[PDB]
Ligand SMILES: COc1cc([C@@H](O)[C@H](CO)c2ccc(O)c(OC)c2)ccc1O
Ligand SMILES: COc1cc([C@@H](O)[C@H](CO)c2ccc(O)c(OC)c2)ccc1O
């Protein structure tokens with residue numbers, strides 16, 4: 001009666017506190033990922049993943065440490081630094097990370113997270129001779145993440161990092177006058193040395209900016225939850241004919 | 243003596259843990275609000291509010307689900323998507339949300355929150371024929387929020403969302419060469435179908451960029467609190483005559 | 485046996501909860517710092533510091549309330565507002581603050597924090613006559629913070645704020661065509677009225693954009709920790725010869 005209560009409260013607290021630590025830990029993975037990719041440090045990125053982890057980029061799946069090192073190292077690091085750990089003279093790749101919404105499973109062994117990034121990228125004039133031809137000298141980019149996390153032996157890791165690029169703009173023209181200089185993946189590893197292990201099913205392939213596709217929310221409506229229905233609200237607005 | 247202590251500690255913890263959950267929940271409302279308005283989904287936004295909730299935009303009060311659906315649906319959704327739930331081809335409305343400072347009431351039934359947003363907005367050339375005339379093709383905007391929250395039947399909701407736009411810049415000219423294309427609200431609903439239920443008192447009406455007005459901090463100085471006084475520090479600097 | 489357990493759990497919880505409060509409190513210092521510097525309010529900034537606190541700007545150390553008021557007041561406030569507490573007509577100085585990674589000491593009396601800022605800055609045409617000559621009318625800037633915190637009489641304060649500017653871009657040309665208009669500090673107070681008390685050792689002086697230098701991470705690899713080694717991952721990528 002007296003003790004059963006004290007027990008109850010300590011179980012209810014340990015559960016709530018673990019959850020609060022879990023949210024901190026999972027956000028911490030995404031922010032750390034950001035600081036590493038800003039420095040073209042593919043080794044630190046690879047280490048964030050479970051050994052069966054997957055990263056998705058331009059609708060291509062890169063599998064395990066090897067696939068992550070292939071995306072961030074073989075492709076990105078050679079593209080931006082010619083294969084040096086950054087940062088390096090004149091090379092900007094700032095992926096500002098924000099707006100985390102993390103949903104931890106009730107059992108505390110898996111989670112989802114929505115995040116986004118805005119990238120300021122480019123070669124200063126002093127290092128412009130190092131830039132490849134198929135890339136603007138300076139650009140903006142933004143993307144959404146809907147990631148999966150696994151608590152593996154009590155340690156939060158990235159199960160699935162799914163970066164969906166939403167738009168790019170050349171600094172000089174902006175998003176309104178710029179077509180994405182990246183297209184859905186076509187050729188897999190090993191045919192393509194920069195390529196993914198697998199391409200997503202045909203239906204799920206994202207065409208790039210200006211094309212848009214909904215990235216569905218991993219998180220439930222945070223007030224109405226499962227009780228939220230669009231059609232309970234739509235009738236209150238008026239649709240106009242132009 | 244022994245048990246009274248154990249009780250004390252469990253009361254002191256349950257209080258601290260609830261607070262930590264409350265901060266997470268309130269930030270979660272603002273970040274969720276962001277993802278919905280990026281998609282021109284006024285129904286999800288309306289659902290975040292208490293039924294006597296208020297949103298303030300350009301010094302106009304929109305009251306309840308109806309008023310929120312009138313701002314985000316009748317006005318914004320028709321303006322940006324011609325009345326479709328987004329996202330849609332070529333239409334960018336990314337309101338990057340950050341820098342939350344949340345102050346929960348001691349009793350845990352109300353809160354305040356300061357937040358801000360920076361908006362990258364526009365129509366790609368491919369959908370430029372859908373853009374209304376009174377709006378730049380592509381622009382930056384930023385604003386501050388000082389919001390009120392109500393824990394209504396143990397559930398955090400928006401009592402008052404007060405977006406105060408601070409500046410806009412056409413992508414091509416930037417903030418320094420751009421006058422706000424939005425002005426303080428003048429005409430109320432029902433006269434104006436896009437209009438607010440009420441306009442703020444005359445004294446409180448904000449003129450727009452380049453005009454600036456302080457948005458006072460909802461949060462106390464986080465080191466000195468109520469002990470903070472400006473005039474204890476001012477004498478240490480030197481004012482210069484130009 | 486029964487009670488020793490209950491004790492154990494309450495000690496283990498009080499420790500975990502204090503940590504969660506500490507992370508909130510330390511982030512809160514950086515976000516509050518942001519809102520104050522956006523308003524050219526050097527008094528609120530000074531109050532965030534321990535009395536032996538230090539701020540580092542362009543490789544110069546400003547010591548104590550006086551040194552902070554000298555940086556943010558005597559220098560910055562006169563430069564941007566001619567010595568008025570902001571905000572003021574036509575003057576933009578929005579330092580968007582994000583991507584906090586906080587590491588609290590095991591004993592809970594000191595912490596480190598990595599953060600970053602992106603600054604949208606400038607004078608509208610209407611106040612362009614107030615701008616000094618050595619500054620672009622409108623610009624972007626970004627920087628990294630690796631700060632130290634001290635829990636002084638149970639109250640979190642800034643021990644060391646170390647802003648390392650990473651890049652600037654004139655709005656009209658962007659980061660790729662812009663050299664930093666700020667250089668490493670050369671002349672100390674009192675010779676220089678805007679100058680720092682001390683300049684960092686010669687070795688540690690940062691040259692500015694386009695020059696880049698690593699800002700080492702205050703935080704351990706958040707999955708592998710001390711077990712993380714670069715050379716365990718590098719062999720998995722391929723270095724390419726161009
Ligand atoms: C897969 O995770 C991410 C990928 C990106 C991309 O936007 C990268 C930047 O690192 C990229 C941008 C422009 C390019 O032209 C490019 O060429 C291959 C690559 C950003 C953030 C991620 O999390
Ligand atoms: C009221 O909440 C918000 C309002 C805004 C506005 O800046 C919106 C964007 O949704 C807006 C921008 C430019 C326009 O020309 C416009 O025409 C009506 C509307 C942003 C964030 C908010 O939280």
Ligand SMILES: COc1cc([C@@H](O)[C@H](CO)c2ccc(O)c(OC)c2)ccc1O
Pocket residue numbers: 521539540541559560563579601603619625627647649665666
């Ligand atoms: C030391 O803390 C910070 C310093 C800055 C600087 O970028 C400031 C803006 O306040 C600055 C920018 C441009 C200038 O030309 C300038 O002249 C002295 C100063 C930003 C954030 C900080 O935390």
